[PDB]
């Protein structure tokens, strides 16, 4: 009984059916074990950090503090309350000041207490072989007050309470920072820098001048990309692709705020008036990839209220 | 000439070959095993 | 084809018959050595859990 | 009860798969 | 026939040569034999 | 094709067998070196651990 | 005859030629063997 | 193909067994030199470490 | 006749020409010799 | 006659412009003998 006797008797027609059936039957086990495979043996998601005082940085792996230097840390706290010599950290009490210096100065730079001062006696200045490296580190520090008390605060409260420390350039080295890596360095030239010469309100403009050439649109898609790459977000994170001149996203005025900042940082701290003397940071010119790294907030700035109220953007 | 028994053949040793490719590879690449360091 | 068997006739020639009967061999030998790794790699590192 | 319904409407299409099989192959 | 002897052979070849680069470029890419330099 | 035993006939030509043969014995060769390449690898550094 | 002697010949020496030179070039760029200016 | 041994007279011509008595000899040649240049080599600088 | 002897004679010139030209630049350009302004 | 006596007079000159112009130009963007301007 059947409508299809040239499918359901003939030997080669029945075996449509049975062959149709496996092939079906087959792909789906196919793609139902391959899935299961894959999805029991990958990893579990890679979850962030949450320190109190840090975005996406860790100081509380902690070995790089002696064992034994802990201690002298508590007998000097127990000796004094309040701190004899401090020129920039005006307003803390020592129990602070130390709780400060092992949390954010350290934790920054990775390095013990003997890197900086004398474990016998803190307080003393210039009686060991490290005190221009203490030196260094004043200078660094109303480095970091001054660029928090000068563009940071001009930032509107929407992008967030987040203020440079010590941990946003140096990112856990205590020398041997390097901006301009070769990763970085992917599509452009590896003798390319950013052009800390010119003004940043107007200086990379170039859509309808007439005065210029490909030449000048090529070094302002190369500081684009570098731009790009800081961020990590393409780009359309500043920029309305149908306008570039336009300003629109309200990111296009915080990358002026920090063009501002970088080169303020080029001119007072990295090289005036020469870099090989009188010059902190070792002449190692900044870039948008040394804080950032990849991420529109830096993975090294501080939350909101952390930092030492004379560091604050807030004083 | 009959296709069935080719087409099938081929079909069969392309899709198992594929198979094993990507299935050593997702395992490499997983980290969970201490293979090939680590 | 007068290898093939009676009811195989239809389905099958005189030669692929012998490369039908190499295939499944092989088959057999890599699902006995599949069997043999996947209980080594089970004792090694289980991963179910 | 994800598994226990599985398992049941797999087993009905199999039990049903093989009944009209063997009704037409026959 | 189904497959000629000669397309078997040009397949099983370059699939042979194909599988050892790949196999010495991962294992010489993984670092893990110490092998010209580490 | 009067070289090929009964078997194979239906398959294999007579200038294809004596390839055939030089292939097969390549292919032990290789896979003999490969098993020693293998020993002598692992008893240098184990990849497993 | 399943393969050409003339095809055969054609296929090995292009094959030698490209393996010897991409040994080179590997040898020389891993900086192991002190040849050229270390 | 007179000067074919009986064996090989269904793979090869008359002239290219001469094409492939000199190929032998060049890889065998070129074996030899090989295996110098290795052991040279190794005895400059061992790569396995 | 397996080969043409003007295709044998082509192809080994090109290759050797090739190799010359290639070897003189990859000393020239390694800077061991002191040759051509050190 | 496995050449014609064009084709040798071609090449021949040919190879030769083409070696003379690229030594030139690679002596003189060597900056090593004072040429046009040191
Ligand atoms: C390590 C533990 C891993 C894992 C790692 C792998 C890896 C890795 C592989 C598999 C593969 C398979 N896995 Mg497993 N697998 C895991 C858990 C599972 C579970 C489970 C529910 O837990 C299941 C059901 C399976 C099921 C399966 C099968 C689909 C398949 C093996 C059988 C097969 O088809 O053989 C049929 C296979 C054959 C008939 C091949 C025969 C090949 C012949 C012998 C020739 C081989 C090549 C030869 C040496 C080349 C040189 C000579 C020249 C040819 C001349 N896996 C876990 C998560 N699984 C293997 C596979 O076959 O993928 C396609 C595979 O590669
Ligand atoms: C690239 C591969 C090569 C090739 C490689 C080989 C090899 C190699 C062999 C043959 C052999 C055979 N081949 Mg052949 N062969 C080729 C092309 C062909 C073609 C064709 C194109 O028309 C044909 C018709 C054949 C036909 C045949 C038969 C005449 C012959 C015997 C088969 C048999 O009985 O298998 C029945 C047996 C099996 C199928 C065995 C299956 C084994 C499985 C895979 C398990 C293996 C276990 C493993 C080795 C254990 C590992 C231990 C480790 C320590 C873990 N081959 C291709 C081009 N062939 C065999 C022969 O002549 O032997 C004297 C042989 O050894
Ligand atoms: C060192 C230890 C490394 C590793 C490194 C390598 C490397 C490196 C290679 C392999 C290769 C293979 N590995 Mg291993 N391998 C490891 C662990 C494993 C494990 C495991 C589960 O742990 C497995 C299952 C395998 C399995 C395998 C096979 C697929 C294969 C060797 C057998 C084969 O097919 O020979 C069949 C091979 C042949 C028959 C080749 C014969 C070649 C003939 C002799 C000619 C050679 C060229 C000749 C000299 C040229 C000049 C002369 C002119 C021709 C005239 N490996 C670890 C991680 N493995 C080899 C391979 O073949 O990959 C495709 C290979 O190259
Ligand atoms: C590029 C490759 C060359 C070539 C190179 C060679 C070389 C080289 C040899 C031959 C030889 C042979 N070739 Mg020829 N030959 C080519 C093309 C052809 C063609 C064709 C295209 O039609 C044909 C029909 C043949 C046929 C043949 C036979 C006439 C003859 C004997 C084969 C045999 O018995 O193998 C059966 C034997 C084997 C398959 C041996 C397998 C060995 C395995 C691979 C293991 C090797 C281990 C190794 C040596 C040890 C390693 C030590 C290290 C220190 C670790 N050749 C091409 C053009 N031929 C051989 C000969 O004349 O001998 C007197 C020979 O020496
Ligand atoms: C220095 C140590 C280096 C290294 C450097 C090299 C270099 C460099 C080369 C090799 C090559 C080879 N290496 Mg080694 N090699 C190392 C370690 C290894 C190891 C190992 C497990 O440790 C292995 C297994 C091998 C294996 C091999 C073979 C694949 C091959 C040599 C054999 C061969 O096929 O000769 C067969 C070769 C021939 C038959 C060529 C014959 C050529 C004839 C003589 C003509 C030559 C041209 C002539 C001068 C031109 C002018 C005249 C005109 C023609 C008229 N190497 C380490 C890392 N090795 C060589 C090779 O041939 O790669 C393809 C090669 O170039
Ligand atoms: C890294 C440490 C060593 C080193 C390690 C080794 C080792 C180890 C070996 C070599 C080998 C060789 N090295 Mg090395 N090598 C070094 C540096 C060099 C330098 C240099 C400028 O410093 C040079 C010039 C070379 C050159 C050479 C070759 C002589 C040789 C590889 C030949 C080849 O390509 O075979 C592959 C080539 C072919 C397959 C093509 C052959 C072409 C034939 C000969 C011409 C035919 C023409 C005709 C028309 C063709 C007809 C058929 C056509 C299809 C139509 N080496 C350094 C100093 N070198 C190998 C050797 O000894 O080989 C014998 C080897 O094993
Ligand atoms: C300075 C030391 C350098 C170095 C620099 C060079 C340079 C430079 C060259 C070589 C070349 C070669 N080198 Mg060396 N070489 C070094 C180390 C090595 C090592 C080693 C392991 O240390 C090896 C194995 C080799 C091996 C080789 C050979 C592949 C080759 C020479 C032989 C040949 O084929 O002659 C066969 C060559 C010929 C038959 C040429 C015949 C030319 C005829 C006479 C016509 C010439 C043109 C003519 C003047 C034109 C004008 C007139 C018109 C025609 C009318 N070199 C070191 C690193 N070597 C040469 C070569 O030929 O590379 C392809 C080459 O040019
Ligand atoms: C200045 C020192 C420089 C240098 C600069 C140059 C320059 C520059 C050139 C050469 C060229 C050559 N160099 Mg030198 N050379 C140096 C070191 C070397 C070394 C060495 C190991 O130190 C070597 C081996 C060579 C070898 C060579 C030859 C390959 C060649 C010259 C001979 C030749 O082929 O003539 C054969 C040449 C001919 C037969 C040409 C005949 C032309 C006729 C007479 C007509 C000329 C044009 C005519 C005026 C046009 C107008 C009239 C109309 C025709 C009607 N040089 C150093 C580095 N050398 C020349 C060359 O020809 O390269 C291909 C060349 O151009
Ligand atoms: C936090 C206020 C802060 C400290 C503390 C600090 C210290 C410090 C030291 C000790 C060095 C010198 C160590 C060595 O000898 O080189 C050093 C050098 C660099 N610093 Fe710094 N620094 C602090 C803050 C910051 C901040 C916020 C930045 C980023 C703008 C910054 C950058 C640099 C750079 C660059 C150098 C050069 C070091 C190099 O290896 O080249 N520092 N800092
Ligand atoms: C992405 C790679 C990218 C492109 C392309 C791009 C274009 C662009 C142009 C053409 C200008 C000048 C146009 C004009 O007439 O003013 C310009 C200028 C600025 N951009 Fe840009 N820009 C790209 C990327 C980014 C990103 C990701 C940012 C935010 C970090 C950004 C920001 C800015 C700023 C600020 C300027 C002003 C330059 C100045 O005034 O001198 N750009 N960009």
Redesign the interface.
């Given at each position: 009984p059947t409508l299809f006797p040239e499918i359901?008797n003939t030997?080669?027609g029945?075996?449509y059916?049975?062959?149709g059936?496996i092939s079906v039957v087959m792909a789906v086990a196919?793609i139902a074990i391959?899935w299961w495979?894959?999805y029991?043996?990958?990893?579990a998601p890679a979850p962030p950090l949450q320190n109190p005082i840090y975005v996406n940085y860790t100081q509380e792996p902690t070995d790089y503090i002696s064992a034994e230097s802990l201690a002298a840390m508590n007998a000097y706290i127990q000796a004094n309350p309040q701190p004899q010599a401090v020129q920039v950290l005006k307003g803390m009490t020592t129990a602070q000041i130390s709780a400060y210096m092992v949390a954010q100065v350290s934790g920054g730079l990775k390095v013990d207490c003997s890197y900086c001062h004398n474990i016998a006696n803190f307080a003393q200045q210039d009686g060991y072989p490290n005190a221009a490296k203490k030196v260094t580190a004043r200078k660094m520090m109303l480095m970091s007050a001054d660029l928090n008390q000068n563009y940071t605060a001009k930032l509107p409260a929407s992008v967030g309470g987040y203020q440079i420390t010590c941990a946003t350039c140096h990112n856990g080295k205590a020398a041997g920072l390097e901006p301009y890596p070769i990763e970085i360095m992917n599509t452009l030239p590896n003798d390319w820098r950013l052009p800390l010469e010119l003004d940043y309100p107007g200086g990379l403009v170039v859509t309808g001048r007439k005065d210029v050439s490909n030449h000048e649109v090529e070094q302002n898609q190369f500081a684009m990309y570098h731009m790009n790459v800081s961020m990590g977000q393409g780009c359309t994170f500043c920029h309305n692709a149908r306008y570039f001149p336009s300003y629109e996203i309200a990111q296009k005025n915080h990358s002026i705020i920090m063009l501002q900042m970088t080169k303020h940082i080029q001119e007072t701290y990295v090289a005036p008036g020469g870099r090989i003397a009188d010059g902190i940071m070792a002449g190692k010119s900044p870039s948008c990839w040394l804080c950032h790294q990849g991420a529109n907030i830096p993975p090294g700035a501080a939350k909101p209220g952390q930092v030492p109220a004379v560091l604050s953007s807030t004083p | 000439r009959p296709f069935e028994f080719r087409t099938s053949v081929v079909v069969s040793t392309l899709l198992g070959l594929v198979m094993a490719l990507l299935i050593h590879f997702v395992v490499l690449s997983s980290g969970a095993f201490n293979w090939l360091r680590a | 084809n007068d290898l093939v068997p009676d009811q195989w006739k239809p389905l099958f020639n005189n030669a692929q018959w012998l490369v039908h009967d190499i295939v499944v061999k092989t088959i057999y030998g890599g699902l006995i050595i599949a069997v043999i790794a996947h209980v080594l790699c089970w004792a090694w590192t289980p991963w179910i859990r | 009860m994800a598994p226990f319904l599985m398992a049941f409407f797999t087993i009905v299409l199999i039990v049903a798969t093989l009944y009209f099989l063997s009704m037409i192959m026959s």
């Open positions: 359901t030997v080669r029945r075996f059916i049975v062959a059936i196919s391959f495979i894959f029991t043996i990958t990893p | - | - | -």
